[PDB]
Design a protein around this ligand. Structure first.
Ligand SMILES: [Mg+2]
Ligand SMILES: [Mg+2]
Ligand SMILES: [Mg+2]
Ligand SMILES: [Mg+2]
Ligand SMILES: [Mg+2]
Ligand SMILES: [Mg+2]
Ligand SMILES: [Mg+2]
Ligand SMILES: [Mg+2]
Ligand SMILES: [Mg+2]
Ligand SMILES: [Mg+2]
Lengths: 143, 117, 63
RNA sequence: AGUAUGGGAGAGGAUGGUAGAAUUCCAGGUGUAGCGGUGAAAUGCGUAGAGAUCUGGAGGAAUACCGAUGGCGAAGGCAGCCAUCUGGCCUAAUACUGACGCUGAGGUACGAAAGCAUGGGGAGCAAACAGGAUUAGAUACCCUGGUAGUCCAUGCCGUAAACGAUGUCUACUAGCCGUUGGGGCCUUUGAGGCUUUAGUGGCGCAGCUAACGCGAUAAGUAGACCGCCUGGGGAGUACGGUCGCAAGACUAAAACUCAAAUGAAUUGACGGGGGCCCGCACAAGCGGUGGAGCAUGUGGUUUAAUUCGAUGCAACGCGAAGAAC
């Protein structure tokens, strides 16, 4: 805004696992206020991955989001360093967008699939991160 | 084939383009690159990035002759004059000195007329 | 300028010193001046304006 | 008011020589894909080798820095360095002439740039002109080339917002602060402080002015001489004459037409002037319209009639919160 700065909107942690990151991803997944269906999808994916490979769901999700998180951006065109909140937001948006275009029937198992793909290193979100890195390198000199 | 230990670098920076020519002593040419030639063919030829790319490619090409120390002479105005020496340092040349050689007439020939834009 | 560089002089600091030396020399302004021919009447008016501004600056400082 | 004698500052004028930087062109060396240009482009240049860098050569024109409401000259105007010829100005004392002065109708000399005649010269820039763009059109602004000219010698031309929009000369009328060239006086720490004179700038009392403003460099207070004006157009025009190779210049009307044309300043309004600031105005996000079927209103067509209103934002699920009779 022109005048003054608005404080960040506090988001209550996820009741089950007490993770603000999980709550933020859940809200990213939500559509039309259907929080119950979003919760079902996210908890189901976390439980599936935990059962498949024995790892703490919160730790694994944080580690994967770290890999998928970007590093640089360009603003209208001059490169700039992304802020921590925008980093996480872009990462989660990229994961959900790539899942939207994935070819599997459902969304929860199809989200777990992309989580494993990103953990391995090959995925649409990682490709988009590499593309933004390339474009930032191309416009590096400015600023 | 020829091997030389020391050389000079000339940066012709203008308002539309930047030329980087690496020569030996006595002015015999060894390599040359241009901001417009190294892609970026548009109004971006004058941007600092194109000059940096040109300097990088010129230095990489000139490394074949085993040049480790370079002297820098810079001519004229234009963005990208500073980027050339930075790119040379990045590629690894040790810059002995940097000097400016822009000509200054002592009220000689009449310049063109003023643009009315 | 002829900015001779020390053994451990970083390239960035060397370029900064070279820019400072060029700014002190003032070659860039001389190069700019000759881009287009300026008429004597315009030059005389510009110098008159410069002198008027300088005297006002001196009086303001003295005040 | 003028003269003799000692010193001082200066892009004052004329003639000749000379030095450095840079642009252009011409040969040679290295070397290979672009160069150049604009808001973006394109014309143009380059593989029979451009642009870039180095060496050598040719020629023209102008003199960076110093540089300064700094300097000089009647005005126009005068810029590197050196020599020759030459005008004026400032400054100290003494010594001379004894009103020898001011202005000036006619007349006469000088007089920017452009232009004209003869001969020479020509790097860069550039009227005209050609091509490429922009635009509805572009005879323009922008871009690529480019002739006269710009330069030199010898003459002509007599013009400019040739302006301080302020004719020359003389005397008098508070003060404060700079700066250029001289004279005089006093301190010392070797440079400073006071005065006076001739220039050149910034404020300002009185006074003047319609106002803005001027104010010892008057547009104040007075004197001497000259030039000029009498509403706006027609019109610095025609006729006649003079000058000029020509372009043109100078002197200079009338018929006719209108009630105005003007100066300074005051409020608003506006500016592709300057700025300052706000709003889901942008930006950052979520979901839509514009594509499909259907509902509803409108414009057009159609009809015997498709009853009448609302029309950018601010009319179009609007008057109508409800037409089968
Ligand atoms: Mg040009
Ligand atoms: Mg007289
Ligand atoms: Mg032209
Ligand atoms: Mg002569
Ligand atoms: Mg006249
Ligand atoms: Mg004049
Ligand atoms: Mg007059
Ligand atoms: Mg006449
Ligand atoms: Mg938006
Ligand atoms: Mg209307």
């Amino acid at each position: 805004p022109r005048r003054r700065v608005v404080a960040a909107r506090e988001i209550l942690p996820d009741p089950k696992f007490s993770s603000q990151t999980i709550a933020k991803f859940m809200n990213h997944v939500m559509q039309d206020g259907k929080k119950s269906i979003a919760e079902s999808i996210v908890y189901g994916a976390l439980e599936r991955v935990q059962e498949k490979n024995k790892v703490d769901p919160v730790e694994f999700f944080e580690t994967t989001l770290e890999k998928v998180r970007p590093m640089v951006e360009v603003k209208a065109q001059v490169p700039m360093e992304v802020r921590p909140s925008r980093r996480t937001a872009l990462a989660m948006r990229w994961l959900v967008d790539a899942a939207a275009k994935r070819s599997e029937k459902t969304m929860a198992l199809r989200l777990a699939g992309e989580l494993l793909d990103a953990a391995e290193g090959k995925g649409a979100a990682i490709k988009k991160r590499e593309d933004v890195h390339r474009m930032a390198e191309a416009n590096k000199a400015f600023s | 084939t020829r091997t030389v230990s020391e050389g000079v670098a000339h940066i012709h920076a203008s308002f539309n383009n930047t030329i980087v020519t690496i020569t030996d002593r006595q002015g015999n040419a060894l390599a040359w690159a241009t901001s417009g030639g190294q892609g970026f063919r548009g109004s971006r030829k004058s941007t600092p990035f194109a000059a940096q790319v040109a300097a990088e490619v010129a230095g990489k090409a000139a490394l074949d002759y085993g040049l480790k120390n370079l002297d820098v002479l810079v001519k004229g105005p234009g963005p990208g004059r500073e980027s050339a020496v930075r790119a040379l340092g990045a590629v690894g040349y040790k810059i002995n000195s940097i000097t400016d050689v822009t000509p200054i007439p002592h009220n000689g020939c009449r310049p063109p007329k003023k643009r009315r834009v | 300028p002829q900015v001779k560089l020390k053994e451990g002089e970083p390239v960035d600091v060397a370029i900064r010193r070279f820019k400072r030396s060029c700014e002190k020399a003032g070659v860039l302004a001389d190069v700019r001046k000759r881009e287009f021919y300026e008429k004597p009447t315009q030059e005389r008016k510009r110098k008159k304006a410069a002198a008027v501004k300088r005297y006002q600056k001196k009086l303001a400082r003295e005040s």
